[PDB]
Design a protein around this nucleic acid. Structure first.
Lengths: 86, 85
DNA sequence: TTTTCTATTTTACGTAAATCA
DNA sequence: ATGATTTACGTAAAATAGAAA
């Protein structure tokens, strides 16, 4: 779907937001709305190979930090490590 | 074969009782021991495999060039007992 | 000696899927 | 069902070694 890996799609998705933080569902909706290949996936449940790959990259790569959302039953924030670490 | 030139030369020097060979002797050993060279033992010193042998001897530190003390020209090629690598 | 080419080793990525809350 | 972590696997690109020159 281009020259970008999943980790970079997610990275710029987070950076696109003004608060530099996104829930997992917000990341999904970005891909569907910002990337040409994911336009078709308007209504996909979890897994979904690409959604599975996204969750995989979030947990695998340490550039992504899962932060407690407070609150109202909403899923956690996915943010980027400032110094990068990795 | 399935060995590198350096290892091939190494096995040549080790095969000698004195653990030392001149360049031409190393050529001979390749000819009378390795199937791929058993045929090419008549090529010039610009052969290519001969060039690669001289190449490996100079580059690789495991090979030590020692002046032939016997007034015969070509110096001895010996193996550094520590490996040098 | 160097430079250029190719083969192999290592790593990274995408994908699928098992396990858990 | 969703959100998250983790292991595994088949390749694809980067990194290195050796040969060729």
């Amino acid at each position: 779907w281009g020259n970008l890996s999943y980790a970079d799609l997610i990275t710029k998705a987070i950076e696109s937001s003004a608060e530099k933080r996104l829930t997992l569902s917000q990341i999904y909706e970005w891909m569907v709305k910002s990337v040409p290949y994911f336009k078709d996936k308007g209504d996909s449940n979890s897994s979904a190979g690409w959604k599975n790959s996204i969750r995989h990259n979030l947990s695998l790569h340490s550039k992504f930090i899962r932060v407690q959302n407070e609150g109202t039953g909403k899923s956690s924030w996915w943010m980027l490590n400032p110094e990068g670490g990795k």
